[PDB]
Write a protein that binds this ligand. Structure first.
Ligand SMILES: CC1(C)CC(=O)C(c2ccc(Oc3nc4ccc(Cl)cc4s3)cc2)=C(O)C1
Ligand SMILES: CC1(C)CC(=O)C(c2ccc(Oc3nc4ccc(Cl)cc4s3)cc2)=C(O)C1
Lengths: 424, 426
């Protein structure tokens, strides 16, 4: 049997023996079926790469729309398996229109049922935009378009595995389990470098927070790498993680990372998935020709996403959080559910010696040049006695509690469990 | 620093004699007031450029938040006049937090009351992000916003900035009603504004202004950003409408990353405030970035599908010359539940131009033809292909065009469709 065969591909994706076709098999270029994924009733459709390379026509598009209507009616997740050059040119405008009706069904489903895309072959034209309307896109390598793909699998079978796990993440979200959170506690601070001025990969921190046995399904790892986002489980419960990555661009927010974070916040908010926000950000960067327009418009989008978000969202400041980027990374002013800080964390407008160079610029400029640097360091040292540090932030009220890093998991879980499912 | 005085700036913006302070003056760096704009009750606040460069502190940010809370309770438009270097560094984290609370209030108001920003001087730091959270940003030339597309409207000077800000309050809050008599009195032969050759480029803006009322400004948004797409507010027989139109003068009128984003953002803004849409379509395809990066047009194009697909205000489409392929679907097509789709009699609706199409469908037959005959053969196949496909008659049979119209009735045909539509759904 040809590897591209759509029944074979659906049967690989679904639970063995669960497949039930929604229509008679035909030459339309699409096969749609009901099935189960680890017990969850799921709808899926597959483009038929053996017929016209999978090109989309009126009758195949109608099968996809019918499957979307079936899935919306029963509130089931819907998975598309994509292998297709686009609309059938020979069918003309009728095919364009039917492709648009596929788009309109995905839009009607948006935020209502989870939509997973598994791209296992070449996907072009209308078949590139279809997956782009869904919530998570898994790409097998055998299938520039930066940002569009969320997860790169190893091969086709591995792509179905990741797709199946995503169905579980969205449809078997579970409950937080305080006792499982405690059993997984470790000293996560031990993963930071000894010098607070050295850069590190944030991913080990993220996996130490998340459940030891569950994978971290990172989204868009190679796009906007100063920001890490993805799905995992915290004490058995599906959570979303966003974390500045000091390893790239100093961990700074820029236009792409703000957009990556905002899109992920909106996805999690839409499906009731709470957020853990691991903050270690020193500032924000401009474009390339130094145009601030992108980070301003995309940064505003990030502000908008957190401000409107109603799922529980808890912030953990590990080391630094400065300036405008501090506000954007789920701050109390944007109604963060709770803000935690590790003991050595600094919450400030900017570095002390940068801040002193502005606040005392005239005094410093009026001092003899041979004794200016010694006065700058003295005023900086006095500035840190008052500004920064957790207790200043605690007194202000922008941090709710300083926590022992050995209790990060149970503190985060406790805060997420106490919040309502909605409002913030 | 008298000319930057907040009470005077507020008074120059509001109707003469309507200003009523919402708190007593101080040196917080913000003055907030209630007023009227051509009669409409309006809330406004002015950063005080005469106090510490307008730098934002806890006290001033608190006046702004109370101004927003007042405007939200009364469902009044709220106008910010911006001249500020950012948060007061000496207040430390407390000022950051208060600036954040200003952001949070703008977010609560989002889509609920119109928010207009008039940037009359420098606006930097948090005072750059404030305007970016609002619906329309008017910028006076003696000004800059720093820390494109952020600025919607560029005025001639500070006073012009207030005039344009005042007109925007009118467009959002005195939307009016459609008037069949005034629509027909304004009918002209819009098609005559096209070139004679269907291959020549042209500025779409005279077509737009000929649809809109002759006595009323077309307030184009972001004219110098994503120039293949034109968007803005004007009036159609007195009724506020939003316009989207591919501009063939730039990039052949193609869609691309930033034109998709320009269009999507503008669609969601009109839809939020009940403003019907006119979509003037003449689009031959879509484009990647110069690096051949498609991820922008895919991501932003999907967001434009979403914006039209979810849109519930009346939205009517006019095909002037041509609309092709995926760009066809995205430009308020029947498949995204456009209210009504109109076409001029010679318009083309097709997957692609006929020559391109038969060049693919009959690649082998053309490659086999003798070089000096492979062209006459191409034109023969292309004319056979457009006998059966691409015309308005065929689009009417299919059902993706609702009506072929006389271009001399464009303006009154669009008005009729928008006026008789449900205010919500589609
Ligand atoms: C022979 C073809 C390549 C012709 C053709 O054009 C398509 C096609 C159909 C639907 C598409 O879907 C969207 N295209 C855009 C473009 C811009 C924006 Cl802003 C949004 C969207 S959505 C995209 C391509 C085909 O499949 C076959
Ligand atoms: C001297 C200053 C205190 C002046 C000042 O006011 C600010 C400032 C304050 C708030 C800001 O607001 C936002 N910044 C970002 C960045 C990224 C993203 Cl994604 C979203 C947002 S929102 C921006 C700058 C400073 O840093 C230094």
């Amino acid at each position: 049997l040809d590897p591209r065969d759509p029944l074979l591909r659906l049967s690989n994706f679904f639970d063995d023996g669960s497949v039930e076709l929604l229509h008679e098999r035909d030459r339309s270029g699409v096969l749609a079926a009901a099935g189960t994924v680890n017990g969850v009733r799921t709808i899926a459709f597959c483009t038929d790469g053996t017929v016209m390379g999978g090109a989309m026509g009126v009758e195949g598009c109608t099968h996809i729309v019918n499957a979307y209507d079936t899935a919306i009616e029963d509130q089931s997740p819907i998975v598309g398996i994509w292998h297709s050059g686009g609309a059938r040119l020979a069918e003309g405008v009728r095919a364009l229109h039917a492709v648009g009706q596929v788009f309109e069904a995905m839009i009607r489903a948006s935020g209502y049922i989870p939509q997973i895309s598994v791209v296992v072959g070449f996907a072009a034209g209308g078949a590139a935009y279809g997956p782009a309307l869904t919530d998570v896109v898994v790409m097998a390598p055998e299938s520039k378009k930066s940002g569009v793909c969320h997860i790169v699998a190893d091969d086709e079978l591995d792509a179905y595995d990741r797709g199946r796990r995503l169905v579980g993440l969205f449809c078997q979200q579970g409950h937080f389990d305080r006792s499982k959170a405690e059993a997984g506690d470790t000293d996560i601070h031990a993963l930071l470098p000894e010098s607070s001025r050295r850069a590190y990969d944030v991913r080990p921190i993220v996996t130490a927070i998340l459940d030891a046995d569950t994978p971290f399904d990172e989204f868009q790892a190679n796009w906007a790498p100063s920001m890490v986002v993805g799905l995992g489980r915290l004490s058995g419960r599906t959570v979303g993680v966003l974390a500045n990555n000091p390893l790239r661009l100093g961990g700074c927010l820029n236009s792409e990372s703000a957009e990556k974070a905002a899109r992920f916040v909106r996805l999690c908010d839409a499906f009731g998935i709470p957020l853990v926000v691991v903050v270690d950000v020193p500032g924000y960067l401009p474009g390339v020709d130094q145009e601030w327009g992108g980070v301003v418009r995309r940064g505003a989008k990030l502000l908008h996403a957190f401000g409107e978000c109603t799922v529980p969202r808890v912030t953990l400041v590990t080391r630094k959080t400065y300036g405008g980027a501090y506000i954007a990374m789920n701050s109390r002013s944007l109604n963060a559910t709770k803000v935690f800080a590790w003991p050595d964390a600094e919450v400030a407008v900017m570095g002390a010696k940068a801040a002193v160079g502005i606040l005392h610029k005239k005094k410093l400029a009026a001092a003899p040049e041979h004794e200016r640097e010694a006065l700058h360091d003295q005023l900086a040292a006095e500035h840190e006695r008052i500004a920064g540090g957790v207790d200043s932030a605690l007194d202000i009220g922008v941090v709710d509690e300083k926590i022992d890093p050995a209790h990060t998991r149970s503190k985060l879980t406790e805060a997420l469990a106490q919040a309502p499912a909605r409002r913030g």
